[PDB]
C-alpha cells in the first residue's frame, strides 16, 4: 500500500535521473561539436585574412 | 499524514519534470539557432574564398 506508493515515487526518480543523464550526454556532444565548428571557422577566417 | 508527505514528494517530482522539460525545449531551440548560424557562416566564408 504505502510500499507500493513508495516504489512509484522511487521509479519516477530513476526515470528522471536516467532521462537527465541522457540529455546531458547529448548536450555534451553538442558543445564539443559547437567548439569544433567554431575553431574550424576561426582558422579559415584567419587564413584567408592572411 | 504519510499521505500528505507522499503528496509533497509527488508534487516535487512533477515540478522537477516540468522544469526539466522546459529547459530541454529551450536548449533544443538554442542548438537549432547555433546550427543555423554556423551554416550561414560556412556558406559566406566559402563564398568569399571563391
Amino acid at each position: 500500500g504505502i510500499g507500493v506508493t513508495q516504489n512509484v515515487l522511487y521509479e519516477n526518480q530513476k526515470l528522471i535521473a536516467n532521462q537527465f543523464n541522457s540529455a546531458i550526454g547529448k548536450i555534451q556532444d553538442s558543445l564539443s561539436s559547437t567548439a569544433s565548428a567554431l575553431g574550424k571557422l576561426q582558422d579559415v577566417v584567419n587564413q584567408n585574412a592572411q | 499524514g504519510i499521505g500528505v508527505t507522499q503528496n509533497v514528494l509527488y508534487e516535487n517530482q512533477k515540478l522537477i519534470a516540468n522544469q526539466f522539460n522546459s529547459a530541454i525545449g529551450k536548449i533544443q531551440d538554442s542548438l537549432s539557432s547555433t546550427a543555423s548560424a554556423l551554416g550561414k557562416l560556412q556558406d559566406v566564408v566559402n563564398q568569399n574564398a571563391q
Binding site: 540529455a23 553538442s30 | 512533477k14 554556423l38 551554416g39 560556412q42
Partner: peptide, 27 residues
C-alpha cells in the same frame, strides 16, 4: 581556403531533434 563544418552542423540538428527522446513523460 574553404571551411568544412557540415558534420558538426548535422550533429547539432540531430541532437536538437533527438533530445525529444530525453523528455520526461508526465503521463
Amino acid at each position: 581556403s574553404v571551411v568544412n563544418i557540415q558534420k558538426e552542423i548535422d550533429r547539432l540538428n540531430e541532437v536538437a531533434k533527438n533530445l525529444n527522446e530525453s523528455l520526461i513523460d508526465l503521463q
